[PDB]
Design a protein around this nucleic acid. Structure first.
Ligand code: FES
Ligand SMILES: [K+]
Ligand SMILES: [Mg+2]
Ligand SMILES: [Mg+2]
Ligand SMILES: [Mg+2]
Ligand SMILES: [Mg+2]
Ligand SMILES: [Mg+2]
Ligand SMILES: [Mg+2]
Ligand SMILES: [Mg+2]
Ligand SMILES: [Mg+2]
Ligand SMILES: [Mg+2]
Ligand SMILES: [Mg+2]
Lengths: 96, 99, 48, 85, 137, 128, 72, 122
RNA sequence: AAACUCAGUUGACACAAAAUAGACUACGAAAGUGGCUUUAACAUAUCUGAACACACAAUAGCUAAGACCCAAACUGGGAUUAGAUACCCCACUAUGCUUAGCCCUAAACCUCAACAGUUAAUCAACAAAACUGCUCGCCAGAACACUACGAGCCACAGCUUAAAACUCAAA
């Protein structure tokens, strides 16, 4: 027919999905620093995915790792380990 | 949905109107309008698009036909015998620049 | 490939022959599993 | 069994004790501790808790949708460019 | 540098001092603000009681105990007793959400004692004993 | 039960697996694996013992053998966990499904059905 | 179209570019359009590899006087 | 299968720590485990005051013992770890390296549920 | 008001319960299941299929033996009332827990049976858009009646099945 007819193919201009910061990286209960990056500095509460900006899979993995570390004596439960307060602030929380 | 047959395709989530079908439809519409005007019919342009309103009115006034771009009161056509008069002549053709 | 890599790894396993040496070597050395993540997805390792 | 004066502790800045107290209260509110403290005064039955949680989720979703709709339609709120037509 | 709301870490090289003392040495002021009472106890860094006061001790009775004025009076009395024992700077830890939760602090400030850190230790069972059934009226 | 020293099904055909170190053999044995590998080994043994073509896994015979292995596992589990009602239901449903499959096989292929019943020890009984 | 993949690669490597789009002109040719034309003609010459075609097109445009500022 | 034992030992001198680690690994091997590695996460203050065997501890030595052991042995090992006086805490887990890092395409943008109600005007 | 002479800081300390995560919507046949670890483990790819059996079935409850934080029918006070009950306050029990059996009921509800298929010319109304094919179960005015009788059941003031007569022109 005519070469100008549009061809059937997938989107080449499509942008890649916004991968979460922990995507492709193993989350371990022994990594107390990474787990502490997602807990409240004052109360030790586990932040929600609307704050951490993580996917469901990584949020569940982080939650399970935090619970395991807390019950196994690797991570404080009622607060954040003070040595990890200087870590980068990946959470979307503003206390002041 | 009913505009699907006239759409050539979608280009980056933007619909494109098939100008091949548009050519035939516009030919038919222009021929019908010309035949109606030739028969001394009454042509009423209608478009509630304010941006073009003035222009459309001018066009009507320049072509010896009638325009209605302002608010369409309830019953200008179904109740024209009461709104205008029992002997009023309804338009023989209505052209929508905006549907 | 998996079984050959396992063969290679078994040489480093802890047995009753080298139990004391491996225990002492572990006692001397330290392993760090902590590392932070940035808002850009870049891993920040800690300093010893 | 934890160390004291680390959790829920705010240092006062130049003696503005009122400001420090308000900051600590805001922290507790943001972390939801106040909600838990007040809701644990009396036992909320599981059916009531589920109904309340479902209502809260529905209200949050509806409020977000309404806010998004208002923000999207706010662009139209400019001055009329076709006055008289 | 700049101010940090986070308390200085025990066993750390913190330059901050209060009357020549470290944060771990500053005496503590516990304020239990129950729904109908406010009990204030000052202790040393080594949990040595120095001053104790409460709305009942101040003479307020029944509902008068559950008032901010009573909590402020108890705070003033406790602060006076602590000042008579040499206390100047205190770390305030408060539990409960009673009406005097803040008011007592004000009284504890009006007595001349300086609050250097406000701490919350409200008992929050993650899930423990089942609380009483909701009141019906 | 197959011997604990038996290699995993995924490693029996690996060349040179008989020349490896004793610790390597132990790591790849059924002893250092969980019960699923033992079930797979039992299923493979039953298939080689009974069915004509062990390659075919979608045949009725392979399905009956796998379901019989699962029933054996469920019975072993319920020997210890007597109050596990979920696995009691699973065992009963698997037994009913195996009865249906045996009925179909007996209606279709009778010599093979007899071989299945003999090898797996199933005593087919008509329903009341 | 077939040129859509080339356009996507060009926008990924270089972005929009200094040359703005004059959409009013029906015969306007953007930098991406010139890159696509060069890619097509070079492929018609006989070269088939995508990476080789891309790099040769970039070098040819740079020789022609095109400011192909790579973003990465 | 592959099990990682996280072991918090009572803070003590090097000879005592070596003896306790050797005893623990010996018990693991007696139960049939094959010890792949022994890592020392080091001595540090516990996140909370863990009390073990009528003794409160604030600091302890964190160690890891990766091994391959039969399933039926694991429970027994836990029991042994419940009776070792020098062990503040001991937890055996399925080794994290065994779990596969399944690829996550990303946070897919799933919108709100559509067509939840009829099309009649309301 | 009653009653406790106990209260507060610190320390030790459960067979109870399982913040935040969870703004997640997953697992299971349903009931249900949201602390941690480990083991075992989540039937069948050809569908349907119980007044006709097998196995389950929240809470409440029964039987026996334990556990005791808290909660709590009941009860005992305190107020209150003319007096008494309920609500409020305090103390406390069965009970909620564990073990071993029973009981087999729920607005056991997504109030929308299982499976397969369709989006083509919409549909009483409302609800969760409208249907087709196929199968099982069930319904035939209201009320009598989650009843009587018969039968079955570890059930003994119970559950399941389930009528009739009289009456009404409605429900
Ligand atoms: S964004 Fe990839 S796992 Fe969440
Ligand atoms: K919990
Ligand atoms: Mg069926
Ligand atoms: Mg049924
Ligand atoms: Mg029941
Ligand atoms: Mg019971
Ligand atoms: Mg009680
Ligand atoms: Mg329900
Ligand atoms: Mg059915
Ligand atoms: Mg009933
Ligand atoms: Mg009855
Ligand atoms: Mg009867």
């Amino acid at each position: 027919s005519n070469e100008d007819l549009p061809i059937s193919m997938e989107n080449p201009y499509k942008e890649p999905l916004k991968k979460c910061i922990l995507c492709g990286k193993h989350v371990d209960y022994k990594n107390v620093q990474l787990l502490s990056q997602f807990v409240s500095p004052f109360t030790g509460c586990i932040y929600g995915r609307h704050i951490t900006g993580l996917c469901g899979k990584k949020q569940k993995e982080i939650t399970k790792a935090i619970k395991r570390a807390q019950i196994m004596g690797f991570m404080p439960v009622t607060y954040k380990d003070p040595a990890y307060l200087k870590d980068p602030k990946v959470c979307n929380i503003r206390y002041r | 949905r009913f505009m699907e047959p006239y759409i050539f395709g979608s280009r980056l989530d933007h619909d494109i109107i098939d100008l091949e079908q548009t050519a035939t439809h516009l030919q038919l519409a222009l021929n019908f309008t010309a035949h109606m005007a030739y028969r001394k019919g009454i042509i009423l342009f209608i478009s509630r698009n304010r941006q073009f309103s003035y222009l459309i009115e001018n066009m009507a006034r320049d072509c010896g036909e009638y325009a209605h771009t302002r608010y369409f009161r309830g019953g200008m056509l179904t109740n024209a015998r009461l709104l205008f008069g029992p002997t009023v002549r309804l338009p023989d053709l209505i052209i929508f620049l905006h549907t | 490939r998996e079984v050959l890599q396992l063969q290679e790894e078994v040489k480093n396993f802890i047995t009753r022959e080298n139990l004391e040496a491996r225990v002492e070597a572990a006692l001397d050395s330290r392993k760090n599993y902590n590392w932070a993540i940035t808002r850009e997805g870049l891993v920040v390792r800690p300093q010893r | 069994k934890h160390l004291k004066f680390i959790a829920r502790t705010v240092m006062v800045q130049e003696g503005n004790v009122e400001s420090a107290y308000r900051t600590l209260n805001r922290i507790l509110t943001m972390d939801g501790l106040i909600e838990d403290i007040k809701h644990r005064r009396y036992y909320e039955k599981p059916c009531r808790r589920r109904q309340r949680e479902s209502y809260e989720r529905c209200r949050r979703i509806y409020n977000m949708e309404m806010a998004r709709k208002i923000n999207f339609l706010m662009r139209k709120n400019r001055a009329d460019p076709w006055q008289g037509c | 540098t700049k101010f940090s709301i986070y308390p200085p870490i025990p066993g750390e090289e913190s330059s901050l001092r209060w009357a020549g003392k470290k944060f771990e040495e500053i005496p503590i002021a516990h304020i239990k603000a129950s729904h109908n009472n406010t009990q204030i106890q000052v202790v040393s860094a080594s949990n040595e009681p120095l001053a104790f006061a409460s709305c009942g001790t101040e003479g307020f009775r029944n509902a008068k105990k559950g008032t901010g004025i009573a909590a402020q009076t108890a705070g003033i009395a406790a602060a006076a007793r602590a000042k008579q024992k040499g206390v100047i700077h205190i770390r305030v830890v408060v539990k409960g959400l009673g009406p005097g939760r803040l008011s007592a602090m004000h009284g504890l400030i009006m007595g001349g004692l300086e609050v250097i850190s406000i701490t919350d230790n409200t008992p929050i069972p993650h899930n423990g004993c089942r609380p009483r059934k909701a009141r019906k009226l | 039960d197959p011997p604990p020293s038996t290699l995993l099904k995924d490693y029996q055909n690996v060349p040179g697996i008989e020349k490896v170190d004793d610790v390597v053999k132990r790591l790849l044995s059924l002893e250092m694996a969980n019960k699923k590998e033992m079930l797979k080994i039992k299923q493979e043994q039953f298939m080689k013992k009974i069915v004509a073509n062990p390659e075919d896994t979608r045949s009725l015979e392979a399905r009956i053998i796998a379901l019989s292995v699962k029933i054996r596992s469920y019975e072993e589990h319920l020997e210890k966990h007597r109050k596990d009602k979920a696995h009691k239901r699973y065992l009963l449903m698997s037994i009913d499904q195996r009865k249906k499959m045996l009925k179909n096989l007996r209606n279709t292929n009778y010599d093979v059905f007899e071989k299945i019943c003999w090898g797996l020890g199933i005593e087919y009984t008509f329903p009341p | 179209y077939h040129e859509d993949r080339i356009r996507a690669k060009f926008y990924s490597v270089y972005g929009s570019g200094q040359r703005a789009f004059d959409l009013f002109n029906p015969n306007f040719k953007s930098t991406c359009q010139r890159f696509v034309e060069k890619y097509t003609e070079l492929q018609k010459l006989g070269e088939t590899d995508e990476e080789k075609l891309f790099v040769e097109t970039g070098k040819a445009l740079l020789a022609e006087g095109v400011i192909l500022r790579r973003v990465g | 299968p592959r099990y990682e034992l996280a072991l918090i030992l009572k803070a003590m001198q090097r000879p005592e720590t070596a003896a306790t680690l050797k005893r623990t690994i010996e018990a693991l091997m007696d139960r049939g485990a094959i010890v792949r590695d022994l890592e020392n996460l080091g001595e540090r203050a516990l996140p909370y005051r863990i009390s073990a065997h009528s003794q409160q501890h604030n600091r302890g030595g964190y160690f890891l013992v990766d091994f391959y052991a039969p399933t039926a042995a694991v429970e027994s090992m836990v029991e042994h770890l419940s009776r070792d006086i020098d062990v503040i805490r001991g937890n055996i887990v399925k080794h994290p390296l065994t779990q596969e890092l399944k690829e996550c395409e990303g946070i897919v943008p799933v919108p709100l549920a559509e067509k939840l109600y009829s099309t009649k005007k309301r």
